[PDB]
Amino acid sequence: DQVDVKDCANNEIKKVMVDGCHGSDPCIIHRGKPFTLEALFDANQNTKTAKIEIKASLDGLEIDVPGIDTNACHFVKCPLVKGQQYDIKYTWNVPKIAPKSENVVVTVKLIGDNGVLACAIATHGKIRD
Questions:
Q1: Where are the annotated coiled coils located?
Q2: Cα dihedral 23/26/31/37 (nearest 10)
Q3: 58 vs 78: CA distance, rounded Å
Q4: Given the DSSP bridges, would you call strands 118-121 and 13-18 parallel, antiparallel or unpaired?
Q5: Strands across the sheet containing 51-58
Q6: For residue 11, is it left (φ>0), alpha (ψ between -120 and 50) or beta?
Q7: CA–CA distance, 42 with 13 (Å, rounded to integer)
Q8: SS3 for the chain, per residue?
Q9: Could you tell me which of 55, 82, 85, 129 has the fewest CB atoms within 10 Å of its CB?
């Protein structure tokens, strides 16, 4: 089902869903497991390379989540031309370092060559082991 998130870009993402959480409900990310999220977004600019960015917050300590795809053109058809929409199905390998944080916030961000192609911010979130 789709999850609850607010595109921090500019209405770019048309809707981001994950195969596990329900959205409004809380999400339990088990560090070490692959969390997949598909985000549709209308390329806000023409670029030959795009990158996805997922950052998880620890209700206090903000961290960055590596082990991801630093080039979403592998799932989307790059160059993403401004005015077309793309659907990226990416497997976000959760880091085994993620500490059981009572509340976590994941940020999905796409970046082409002119700025951030899109963006997403999840609220209700929780990490477990």
A1: none
A2: 0
A3: 33
A4: unpaired
A5: 61-62, 51-58, 105-111, 118-121
A6: left
A7: 7
A8: CECCECCCCCCCEEEEEECCCCCCCCCEEECCCEEEEEEEEECCCCECCCEEEEEEEECCEECCCCCCCCCHHHCCCCCECECEEEEEEEEEECCCCCCCCCCCEEEEEEECCCCCCEEEEECCCEEEC
A9: 129
Please name the amino acid found at residue 21. Answer: C
- CA-based nearest residue to 65, from 73, 57, 76: 57
- On whether the CB atoms of residues 57 and 63 are closer than 8 A, the answer is yes
Lookup: tokens for 47: 């670029």
Residue that the structure tokens 């799932």 belong to: 75
CATH fit for domain 1-129, picks 3.30.230.10, 2.60.40.770, 2.30.40.10, 3.40.1360.10 = 2.60.40.770
What is the rounded CA–CA span in Å between residue 127 and residue 129?
A: 7
